[PDB]
């Protein structure tokens, strides 16, 4: 892609959650989130093969039925109060359609089975826009309405955002396919509180992405997109087991580790309203997302596998590619919990 | 939930009030953390691209130190607004609704009987 | 009304049923949201001059636009498709599970 | 003529609902047109000519390129049309049939409040200005150019754009 | 109700016309008569196969361009606006605008016809 | 680079047409003087009743009346 | 109606015990339903017929396992008479588990199911007893 | 909850003017000028009082001083006035400019009879400043109390009571 | 017409308030006949 | 909203036509003006739970302005005894309800 269309299509991009975040009326935060399924398609189409024409194919017509179930339920507010703003005294009707589109915008389950398959059909990056960036608007329209949600689907899509993730991260061989349902398992995460102190879902979010981005960096910087792959890096770039260690651990919550803070702090404030056992199911089910992390660690980082005959000439070469970024983004990770108290 | 609080400006650092806080001292311990997690950023940012450690990135690695202390003062100091804020509203909720707080008067151990459990 | 409004919100439903339930084919699924489309158009613009809400009236031909939009990206996708594969079914899609 | 807009209504339904049950995308374009053609009907109907007007061209517009892919890509050698198959017949038939049912129910349950039968066509304008002028639809339209300029700036980045992507997905 | 009456008359004017035409000559059905032209001899497949089109780019854009005309289509009105400034800066921008779109597909050979 | 237009207008003079007519249409408005007078013709139109105003005393440049010396002479608009 | 499996707790456990037996069942129809609309979906059959068939076994599958953990309730709490007691719902929850491994020949899922519903049900009675409300209202 | 009050039939019972569109376009901007003060005065209190209830007597004043005007118009010039509004309504939007030497005639014969001169372009569409005896509404749209705004909480803030209260952080 | 049912204010409001709310074409035009109603809308909907 | 932004500088890139009662292009008025004005500036200083309940006659006001769903029961119910009352033959219906008045202008 020449400059030009480059600077366009980014520039889309961009301005699909701003202008969700920055609008009044819920008919421009539509606007937004379609310049941010419009722009979305030319990359994840990019390198033109089948498997990125079928992910393409799916996002796009997953996408599009839940906008236009936004835009009833707007149309539906509209019709009731004559303004385009969900007020108190809305239909809960039409707040749990919005919902529940919202929720396939985003990938939560039973809304999940796209977001997998087209993270595989695409590359590391688009994998990271999409896991990160494309999350922050449709988040910001439950952010900005949530004392009108209710409190059961709203817990119901975030437990079986949880187990299915945990369940479907078991048996991935693939990294791409791994990410995604960690995103599923963490959305559940915040939308579980969602209803109870926002704050709290964009800290699970910022978390999130702060963990995300650079493991993505660490497949990029090799291309890894398997355990085989990613198992060779004892040999390629092996300064960075301690970091993608480190990230793993966080990514699945253990306590030194700034990525149990979300979840400590999520189980405070749920356990503040006496939803007691929806927590500790939660809590539980992170376990298991824990479990294919720490095989997948063992796999790069403890027991060394096999390497080829061809993998010296890396050693011969040099690189460039570690941005600066990974090493800040994944040291603000891993290392932040006493930093917690001014994080909450 | 104190974004509707009155008076709340928005997309405003430090607002005014902020400035009758005291600040932090600068050898405050997370500040100082702060730092040595940018000394730690520079060494593994060295470490990743196949180079030196403590020897090679001097400007690096002060550069480092210096915006991840430049930053953490002032969002430390955002942080000490933030709970300062939290803790004048909530001054004021009590001292506004009394009848919901009401001034309780506690007992002894020699008027309450609690109630005795042997080991055996 | 009432009435109107009701069956529009029912033709709405017949839509996203229709593009929900597939068949072999893809067009018609776009077919389908751009009937979603054209009902939520006229669900707005009816509620607009009901209210003589002439401020909103800005509302339906934004919606028209981006459907339109949505439609040029999901026919450039089916060319793509058909590119592919040649025929423009649904099912030949079914090599990401793997 | 008092039922002409539960008329118009009911007809943009079948037109939909045969959409749905999705024969080839010729009969479904048909569709899509009749059911553009009634909509345009209807927002006239309410006091709206310029929204109609614009619905009918915008979907004609639409539908002929819809024929000019089809032809090329959703092509069979027997197109499925809605007798071609006895099941979406039926559905058909029982679709008319239910909501027909369903009309007739809710007019039961309650006796006004979502369907009047019995008043029909008494509730349609609310509150006309009987003495008007520079009042009908397309000053509203009009204020894209004014007081609602931001409507008009983010559709056209959306259209300009959509060429971009346009080029790169066919590339 | 007037033009409900003119475009019912000229339905019932093509209806009965077709009528005419069907139900007043003479038939001699046979299938080698009601079989499809293809210039004497007979056709090698169906028509009902893919006819590959070479501008589906300039058709799409054909959309976006429809569009375009929907919006500039409210300056008669427009215009009575006190504003008359805004309007025409918005205008401006909006045409063109669409001339750079037309111009890029232009040189990147959208408008040509793919061989 | 006037060689450049030289050729341009007689190859493809459709888009030399083209810019020249885009940019005067551009450039004109700023010129002319007649163009501040679309808005106040635009203004004096009165599609809209002119509500009466309450005496409170103190309207010395509000008319009294229609055809009072006060209020906006629309004499500018005659003989323009 | 919400009234109808409201029902089941207008009289203690001991009482009534065919209402509450075939409201249990009623239950498990309807989850088993939803299991099967799940299954027939995705990974369907090869036929209409066998989708059939597999909507029949899992709704009666799950409307005996209501069945037998209702019966078993009702009846260790007349027998032993002890309402507030969990000790009947993790016997009548073992019972469902046991008709699991039975309808699926399997006797690793009967016990499996028998502790991990027996245990369900237990907690669920405490909770009942004791005013767990999930999907609670926000109070802070 | 509460009933509402309306005029008898005979609280309404009017000497209506009877008088068609096109003769009364052509006395319009005569109309204007006599006839204003009784016109602006209905006009200020429809507006400032939002119920025709409570304006009726305005509204006879003003019929009552359009039927004195056309009876002046009736006892003179009423054969030049009557040429100008017949070859005024053979037009479908009743346009002046066709019928422009018939207005001579009747301005001519109006103003040599009452001096009623005709008003220039933009004089009636302007605002012109009314008094009367009525008061002012007290209170119109019959608006409840508004409810009073939640107190702010005076003080100078302090540091947060022993820092954060999180778990253990001492600081 | 409604001198007979139990519990009928007559002049009775739909509004707690007390305000002057103009009416609307069903309202009005409601007990008339079906002409007025059907020329009240579709009157300027369908020119002249 | 989430990121104040148009507050911030003081625009109004959307925010003048949130509703009914907002700058009609010239100065006509939309049905329900004033009962969402009225609405609307009870409920001002107060956020959401409190206008939920001290501002609730007001948008019950509104809801029957713009719904209008008490006004269609009650000509419903005229109407049905009307026909009721007619079918007897009880009720007689005037001359300016059987299209035979004097018109008033
Ligand atoms: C804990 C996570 C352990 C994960 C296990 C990773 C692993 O398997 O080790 C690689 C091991 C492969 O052995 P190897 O081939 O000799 O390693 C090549 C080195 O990369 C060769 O590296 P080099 O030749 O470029 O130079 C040596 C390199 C050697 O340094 C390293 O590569 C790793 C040092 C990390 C030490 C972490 C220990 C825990 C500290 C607690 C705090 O740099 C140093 O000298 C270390 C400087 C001081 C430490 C800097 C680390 C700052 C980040 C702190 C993060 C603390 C997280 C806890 O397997
Ligand atoms: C010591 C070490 C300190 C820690 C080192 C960093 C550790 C790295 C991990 C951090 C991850 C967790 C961060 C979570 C967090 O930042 O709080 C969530 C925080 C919670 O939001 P909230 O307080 O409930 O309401 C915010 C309102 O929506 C919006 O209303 P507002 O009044 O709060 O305005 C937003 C405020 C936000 O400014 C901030 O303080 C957020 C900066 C966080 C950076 C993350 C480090 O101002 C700005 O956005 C800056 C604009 C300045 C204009 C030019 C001067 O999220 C945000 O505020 C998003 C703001 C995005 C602004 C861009
Ligand atoms: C180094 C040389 C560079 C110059 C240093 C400047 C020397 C100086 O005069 O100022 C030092 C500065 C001020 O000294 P000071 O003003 O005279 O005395 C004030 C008190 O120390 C007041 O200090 P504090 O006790 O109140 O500490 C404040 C802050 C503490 O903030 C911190 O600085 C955290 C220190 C690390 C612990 O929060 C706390 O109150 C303690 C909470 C600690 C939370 C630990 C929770 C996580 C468990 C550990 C996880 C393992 C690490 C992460 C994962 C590693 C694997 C990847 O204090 C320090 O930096 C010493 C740090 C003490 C470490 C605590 C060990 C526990
Ligand atoms: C159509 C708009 C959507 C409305 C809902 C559908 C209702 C009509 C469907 C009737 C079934 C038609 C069908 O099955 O296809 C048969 C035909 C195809 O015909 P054929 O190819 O099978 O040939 C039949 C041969 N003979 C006559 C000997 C039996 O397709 C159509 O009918 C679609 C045409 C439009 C139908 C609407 C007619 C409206 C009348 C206006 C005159
Ligand atoms: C939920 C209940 C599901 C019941 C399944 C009924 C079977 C069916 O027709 O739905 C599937 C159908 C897809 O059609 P297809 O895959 O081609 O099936 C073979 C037909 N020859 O789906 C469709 O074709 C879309 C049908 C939409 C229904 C619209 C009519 C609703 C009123 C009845
Ligand atoms: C309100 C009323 C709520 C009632 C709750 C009912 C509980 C339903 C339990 C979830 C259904 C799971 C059914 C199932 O077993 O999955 C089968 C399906 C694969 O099918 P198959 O392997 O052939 O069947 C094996 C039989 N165990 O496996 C799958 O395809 C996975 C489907 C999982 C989706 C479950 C989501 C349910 C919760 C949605 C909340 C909204």
Request: aromatic share 12%; proline share 6%.
């Amino acid at each position: 892609m020449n400059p030009i269309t480059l600077a366009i299509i980014y520039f889309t991009i961009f301005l699909g959650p701003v202008i969700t975040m920055s609008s009044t009326n819920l008919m421009l935060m539509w606007v937004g989130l379609e310049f941010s399924l419009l722009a979305i398609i030319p990359m994840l189409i990019n390198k033109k093969n089948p498997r990125s024409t079928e992910a393409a194919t799916k996002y796009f017509v997953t996408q599009a039925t839940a906008s236009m179930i936004i835009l009833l339920a707007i149309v539906l507010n509209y019709k009731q109060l004559g303004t385009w703003m969900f007020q108190q005294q809305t239909n809960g009707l039409i707040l749990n359609m919005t919902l529940m589109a919202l929720s396939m915008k985003l990938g939560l389950a039973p809304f999940h089975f796209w977001l997998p398959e087209v993270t595989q059909g695409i590359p590391l990056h688009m994998g990271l826009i999409l896991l990160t960036w494309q999350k922050i608007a449709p988040l910001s329209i439950l952010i900005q309405i949530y004392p009108l949600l209710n409190s059961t689907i709203i817990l119901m899509l975030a437990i079986t955002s949880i187990f299915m993730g945990a369940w479907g991260g078991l048996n991935q061989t693939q990294m791409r396919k791994i990410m995604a349902y960690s995103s599923i398992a963490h959305m559940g995460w915040m939308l579980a509180i969602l209803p109870y102190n926002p704050s709290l879902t964009l800290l699970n979010l910022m978390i999130y992405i702060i963990l995300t981005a650079p493991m993505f960096m660490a497949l990029m910087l090799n291309n890894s997109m398997t355990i085989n792959s990613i198992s060779l890096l004892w040999n390629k770039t092996p300064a960075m087991l301690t970091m993608i260690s480190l990230m793993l651990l966080s990514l699945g919550g253990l306590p030194p580790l700034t990525g149990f803070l979300p979840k400590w702090i999520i189980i405070t404030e749920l356990m503040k309203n006496n939803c007691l056992i929806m927590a500790t199911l939660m809590a539980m089910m992170a376990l298991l997302n824990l479990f294919f992390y720490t095989r997948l660690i063992y796999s790069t980082s403890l027991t060394m596998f096999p390497t080829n005959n061809n993998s010296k000439m890396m050693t011969h070469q040099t690189k460039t590619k570690p941005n600066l970024m990974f090493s800040t983004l994944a040291i603000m990770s891993t290392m932040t919990l006493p930093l917690a108290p001014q994080l909450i | 939930m104190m974004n509707g609080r009155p008076g709340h400006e928005p997309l405003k650092f430090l607002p005014d009030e902020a400035r009758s806080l005291p600040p932090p001292k600068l050898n405050d311990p997370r500040l100082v953390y702060m730092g040595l997690l940018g000394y730690c950023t520079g060494l593994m940012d060295n470490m990743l691209r196949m180079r030196p450690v403590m020897r090679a990135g001097l400007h690096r690695q002060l550069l480092f130190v210096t915006s991840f202390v430049f930053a953490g003062y002032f969002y430390l100091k955002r942080q000490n607004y933030l709970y300062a804020v939290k803790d004048h509203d909530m001054f004021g909720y009590i001292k506004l609704h009394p009848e919901d707080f009401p001034e309780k008067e506690k007992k002894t151990y020699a008027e309450i009987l609690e109630p005795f459990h042997p080991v055996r | 009304m009432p009435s109107t409004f009701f069956n529009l919100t029912m033709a709405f439903s017949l839509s996203l049923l229709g593009t929900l339930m597939f068949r072999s084919h893809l067009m018609s699924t776009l077919l389908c949201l751009e009937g979603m489309v054209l009902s939520l158009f006229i669900m707005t613009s009816v509620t607009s001059l009901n209210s003589n809400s002439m401020s909103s009236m800005p509302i339906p031909i934004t919606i028209l636009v981006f459907a339109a939009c949505e439609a040029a990206v999901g026919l450039a996708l089916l060319v793509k498709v058909s590119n592919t594969y040649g025929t423009d079914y649904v099912q030949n899609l079914n090599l990401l599970q793997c | 003529m008092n039922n002409y807009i539960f008329v118009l209504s009911s007809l943009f339904l079948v037109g939909c609902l045969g959409l749905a049950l999705k024969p080839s995308p010729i009969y479904g374009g048909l569709g899509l047109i009749v059911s553009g053609f009634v909509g345009c009907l209807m927002v006239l109907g309410f006091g709206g000519s310029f929204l109609g007007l614009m619905v009918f061209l915008i979907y004609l517009g639409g539908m002929l390129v819809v024929f000019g892919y089809t032809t090329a890509m959703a092509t069979e050698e027997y197109p499925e049309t809605w007798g071609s198959n006895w099941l979406i017949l039926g559905f058909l038939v029982l679709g008319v049939i239910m909501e027909v049912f369903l009309i007739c129910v809710l007019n039961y349950y309650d006796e006004v409040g979502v369907i009047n039968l019995d008043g029909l066509g008494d509730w349609l304008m609310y509150e006309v200005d009987d003495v008007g002028v520079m009042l009908e639809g397309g000053i509203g339209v009009a204020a894209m150019y004014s007081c609602a300029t931001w409507m008009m700036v983010v559709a056209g980045w959306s259209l300009f754009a959509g060429i971009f992507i346009i080029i790169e997905i066919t590339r | 109700m007037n033009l409900y009456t003119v475009i019912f008359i000229n339905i019932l004017l093509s209806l009965t016309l077709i009528l005419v035409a069907f139900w007043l000559p003479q038939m001699n059905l046979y299938s080698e008569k009601a079989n499809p032209y293809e210039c004497g001899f007979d056709p090698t497949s169906s028509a009902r196969l893919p006819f590959s089109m070479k501008f589906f780019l300039v058709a799409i854009t054909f959309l976006l361009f429809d569009l375009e005309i929907a919006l500039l289509l409210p300056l008669p009105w427009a215009i009575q606006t006190i504003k008359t400034s805004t309007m025409m800066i918005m205008a401006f921008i909006l045409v063109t605008i669409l001339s750079l779109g037309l111009a890029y597909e232009w040189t990147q050979k959208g408008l040509e016809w793919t061989e | 680079i006037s060689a450049f237009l030289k050729n341009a207008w007689a190859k493809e003079p459709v888009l030399v047409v083209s810019f020249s007519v885009w940019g005067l249409a551009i450039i004109m408005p700023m010129i002319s003087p007649y163009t501040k007078y679309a808005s106040m013709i635009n203004k004096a139109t009165p599609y809209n009743y002119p509500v009466p105003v309450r005496d409170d005393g103190n309207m010395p440049d509000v008319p009294s009346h229609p055809q009072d010396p006060l209020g906006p002479s629309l004499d500018w608009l005659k003989n323009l | 109606v919400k009234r109808f499996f409201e029902s089941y707790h207008e009289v203690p456990d001991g009482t009534q015990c065919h209402r509450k037996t075939y409201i249990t069942t009623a239950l498990g129809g309807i989850c088993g339903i939803i299991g099967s609309a799940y299954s027939v979906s995705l990974n369907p059959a090869d036929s209409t017929l066998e989708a059939v068939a597999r909507v029949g076994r899992y709704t009666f599958t799950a409307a005996a396992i209501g069945a037998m953990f209702g019966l078993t309730t009702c009846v260790s709490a007349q027998v032993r008479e002890k309402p507030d007691d969990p000790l009947n719902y993790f016997i009548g929850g073992c019972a469902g588990g046991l008709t699991l491994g039975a309808r699926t020949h399997s006797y690793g899922t009967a016990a499996m199911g028998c502790v991990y519903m027996g245990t369900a049900a237990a907690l669920f009675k405490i909770g009942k007893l004791e005013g767990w409300e999930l999907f609670p209202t926000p109070k802070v | 909850p509460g009933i509402v009050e309306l005029p008898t039939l005979e609280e309404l019972k009017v000497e209506e003017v009877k008088v068609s569109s096109a003769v009364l376009k052509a006395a319009a901007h005569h109309y204007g000028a006599q006839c204003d003060k009784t016109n602006k005065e209905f006009m200020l209190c429809r507006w400032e009082e939002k119920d025709p209830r409570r304006c009726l007597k305005e509204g006879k004043l003003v019929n009552g001083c359009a039927l004195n005007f056309f009876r002046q118009i009736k006892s003179h010039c009423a054969e030049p006035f009557t040429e100008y509004w017949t070859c005024l309504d053979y037009s479908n939007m009743q346009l002046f400019r066709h019928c422009r030497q018939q207005q001579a005639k009747f301005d001519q014969c109006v103003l040599d009879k009452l001096g009623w001169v005709r008003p220039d372009l933009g004089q009636l569409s302007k605002v012109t400043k009314v008094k009367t005896d009525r008061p002012l509404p007290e209170n119109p749209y019959h608006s409840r109390a508004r409810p009073e705004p939640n107190p702010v909480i005076e003080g100078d803030l302090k540091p947060a009571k022993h820092g954060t209260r999180f778990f253990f952080w001492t600081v | 017409i409604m001198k007979d049912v139990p519990n009928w204010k007559v002049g009775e409001s739909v509004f707690h308030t007390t305000r002057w709310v103009p009416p609307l074409i069903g309202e009005m035009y409601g007990l008339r006949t079906k002409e007025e109603m059907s020329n009240a809308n579709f009157g300027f909907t369908w020119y002249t | 909203p989430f990121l104040d932004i148009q507050k911030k500088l003081g625009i109004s890139l959307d925010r003048h036509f949130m509703f009914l009662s907002a700058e009609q292009p010239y100065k006509n008025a939309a049905r329900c003006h004033a009962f969402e004005k009225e609405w609307i500036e009870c409920a001002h200083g107060i956020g959401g739970t409190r206008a939920k309940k001290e501002c609730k006659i007001e948008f019950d006001d509104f809801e029957e302005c713009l719904l209008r769903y008490k006004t269609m029961r009650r000509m419903h119910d005229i109407k049905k005894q009307r026909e009721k009352l007619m079918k007897e033959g009880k009720y007689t219906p005037p001359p300016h309800h059987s299209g035979r008045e004097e018109p008033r202008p």
